[PDB]
Write a protein that binds this ligand. Structure first.
Ligand SMILES: OC[C@H]1O[C@H](O[C@H]2O[C@H](CO)[C@@H](O)[C@H](O)[C@H]2O)[C@H](O)[C@@H](O)[C@@H]1O
Length: 322
């Protein structure tokens, strides 16, 4: 059995949806952020939720499931594609970067909902051609549609990117998914063997380096004393197997299995100073500053949409009790 229910979340219109296992709340006006995800059998909130509307707007990439299109940093807000130069807003002033794209602070539209014995679906969408300031930076008719499905114990979260315009464009997407993570008693694992060497502006040098603690990382490890803001390379490209981050909550015995498809070639892991009680395992289809790297696309994960084409990038959050 499943349900949809319109609600007000901190004074903004929102949609609660779920079944007997899981319940989400998506907030279309807040960059289509999935702001709440609850495990119903244990009654546990999984995501970092904002105390107030104002605290959300202070840091809208540090709550729920923010959408990063494109993800992370572009040096000087500048890059070229097929001969043409682009200038995105420099919103990270100290490191002189564009950071986190166009969509996490814009209003999306609810395009449909669908309920069957296969689960409950909510779809949201935004058309960048309708955003005049975005068009100044990125004059392309990109349309992004999110399809959220809750079925059994999994939230499926699919992004479909469409080129409805006259020219090709490069694209990447990531999520800044912020889980509650008590440092003392939760464990984290990730399918990664290598990570990208970063400079003081958090920009890749182009070099990869082995993750020294990769065995611990694969198995599940605590993050006490470890401060992360790291760009990991998914091990899937080179080794196969899985592409996923796992969080294990030791008290209620809840496993959160965050899977992503082969397009999600990189994971950024961020836990601030380690004392903020959250963790962001962020799957990205492209590496930070991918647009400015002369490296093969099999590595960077850069993608291009020709006019009239579309691509769906899949990921999912499964909650297991063990
Ligand atoms: O932003 C345009 C420049 O992009 C590249 O350089 C930046 O990105 C590199 C890779 O992350 C950094 O090492 C470098 O420090 C950044 O300045 C490109 O190599 C430059 O030619 C472009 O002007």
């Amino acid at each position: 059995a499943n349900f949809i229910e319109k609600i007000t979340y901190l004074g903004t219109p929102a949609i609660k949806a779920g079944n007997e296992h899981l319940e989400m709340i998506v907030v279309p006006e807040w960059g289509s952020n999935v702001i709440s995800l609850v495990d119903k059998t244990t009654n546990v909130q999984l995501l970092r939720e904002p105390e107030t509307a104002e605290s959300f707007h202070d840091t809208p990439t540090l709550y729920g499931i923010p959408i990063l299109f494109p993800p992370n940093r572009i040096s000087d807000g500048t890059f070229s594609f097929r001969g043409r130069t682009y200038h995105f807003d420099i919103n990270e002033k100290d490191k002189h970067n564009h950071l986190h794209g166009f969509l996490y602070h814009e209003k999306w539209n609810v395009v449909t909902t669908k309920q069957t014995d296969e689960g409950v679906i909510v779809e949201t969408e935004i058309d960048l051609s309708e955003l005049p300031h975005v068009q100044k930076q990125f004059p392309h008719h990109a349309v992004v549609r999110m399809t959220y499905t809750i079925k059994e114990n999994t939230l499926f979260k699919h992004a479909t990117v469409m080129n409805k315009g006259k020219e090709a464009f490069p694209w990447g997407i990531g999520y800044h998914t912020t889980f509650i993570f008590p440092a003392e008693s939760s464990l984290f694992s990730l399918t990664a063997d290598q990570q990208w060497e970063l400079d003081e502006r958090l920009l890749p040098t182009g070099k990869l380096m082995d993750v020294p603690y990769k065995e611990a990382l694969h198995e599940g490890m605590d993050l006490r004393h470890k401060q992360l803001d790291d760009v990991f390379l998914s091990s899937y490209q080179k080794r196969g197997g899985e592409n996923q981050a796992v969080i294990y909550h030791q008290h209620a015995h809840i496993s959160i299995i965050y899977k992503a498809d082969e397009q999600f070639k990189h994971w950024v892991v961020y836990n601030a100073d380690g004392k903020q009680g959250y963790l962001c395992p962020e799957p990205y289809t492209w590496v930070t500053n991918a647009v400015n790297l002369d490296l093969p696309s099999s590595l960077t994960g850069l993608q291009v949409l020709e006019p009239g084409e579309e691509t769906t990038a899949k990921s999912s959050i499964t909650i297991e009790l063990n």
